[PDB]
């Protein structure tokens, strides 16, 4: 019931619902049109969504880098519904992210995370991700436009 | 001034990225010029050049939050002898102008915490490390 699969265009509605649940949990805003945009992204772009049943997802983008022949991957969104956490779903999603980007010969996986999100940080650290390069923490700066 | 690099400019861009990595003692892969020539040719990334002394490398990728892309300033560098004279400011100003032509919904930049001079530069030009009272971190795994 919760095996990991690659989302198809017709799955955009389920992905959108999970993203809304994610934003609702963290009291962050949602634009209209998530479903339509996910449908276009899944069909046409260098990006994919993995679904665990209807209870978790991972949204990955692939973009060019001069450092590698393959892309740099970014896990833009990762979410497991609260009642299904601490059961290995997130581990299985992340393992499948690494499996799928390996098919594309991706040179790196990147993930941005809030410092306050200590559970997610411990999860990523325990599954082979680091905040350190050249002996320094790495920070994300943004400007919304 | 600042110009959008062409495939013919791949040698210059590669040289600057090499110089950047040499300055900070970080690894340089082979084939940078050839890879930049391929990347410049395609439609989801671009390089801005300040003469032959500075560059910005920007990627564009999809997001479900906007019709336009999320832009990332994956590399920004001005040659040491030309710093502190507004070149970086001009490059970043042109980054915003070019991604606006793509209706990009956000610009993202990852930077090391120890690069305090670069962070002061980004903060002075409208970038923030804070959301919901929390700093934002980058995690990676090299593959
Ligand atoms: C770019 C971004 O999206 S960054 C923000 C990341 N997303 C979020 O924070 C959203 C809210 N959180 C979540 O959705 C989840 O907390 C996630 C996605 C971070 C992790 O998902 P989960 O399904 O909880 O992960 P999983 O169960 O595999 O592992 C969590 C812990 O449970 C442990 N665990 C696994 N199976 C079991 C089990 N049967 N019994 C008890 N503990 C278990 C794991 O070992 C892990 O511990 P660790 O973090 O100390 O290594
Ligand atoms: C995604 C990334 O590339 S993150 C890393 C960014 N790149 C680097 O740090 C490389 C080293 N530095 C540089 O190449 C340049 O100095 C840049 C790109 C940071 C700024 O370019 P400049 O042409 O110096 O910018 P400009 O003259 O418009 O503004 C000056 C500000 O640049 C910053 N700056 C100047 N020298 C340096 C330096 N050696 N290292 C970092 N930041 C610097 C300071 O904040 C300075 O402001 P101050 O007068 O308060 O010190």
Residue numbers in the entry:
A (entry chain A): 4 to 148
B (entry chain B): 6 to 148
What is the paper's account of this structure, in its own sentences?
The primary mode of resistance to aminoglycoside antibiotics is through chemical modification catalyzed by aminoglycoside-modifying enzymes. Here we present the first structural and functional studies of two aminoglycoside-modifying enzymes that do not use target mimicry, AAC(3)-Ia and AAC(3)-XIa. X-ray diffraction studies reveal that these enzymes bind aminoglycoside antibiotics in a conformation where the central 2-deoxystreptamine ring is in boat conformation. Similar to other AACs, AAC(3)-Ia and AAC(3)-XIa display the GNAT superfamily fold.
In contrast, all five structures of AAC(3)-XIa contain both protomers of the physiological dimer in the asymmetric unit. The AcCoA binding pockets of both AAC(3)-Ia and AAC(3)-XIa have a similar tunnel-like conformation that extends to the aminoglycoside binding pocket, and our structures show that the overall binding of the CoA molecules is conserved across all of the structures. In all our structures, the highest concentration of hydrogen bond interactions between enzyme and CoA occurred in the pyrophosphate moiety. The greatest difference between the coenzyme-bound structures of both AAC(3)-Ia and AAC(3)-XIa occurs in the positioning of the adenosine moiety. In the AAC(3)-Ia structures, there is a shift of around 90°, and in the AAC(3)-XIa binary structure with AcCoA, we see a rotation of the ADP moiety of around 180°. The flipping of this group can be attributed to the solvent-exposed nature of the adenine binding pockets of AAC(3)-Ia and AAC(3)-XIa.
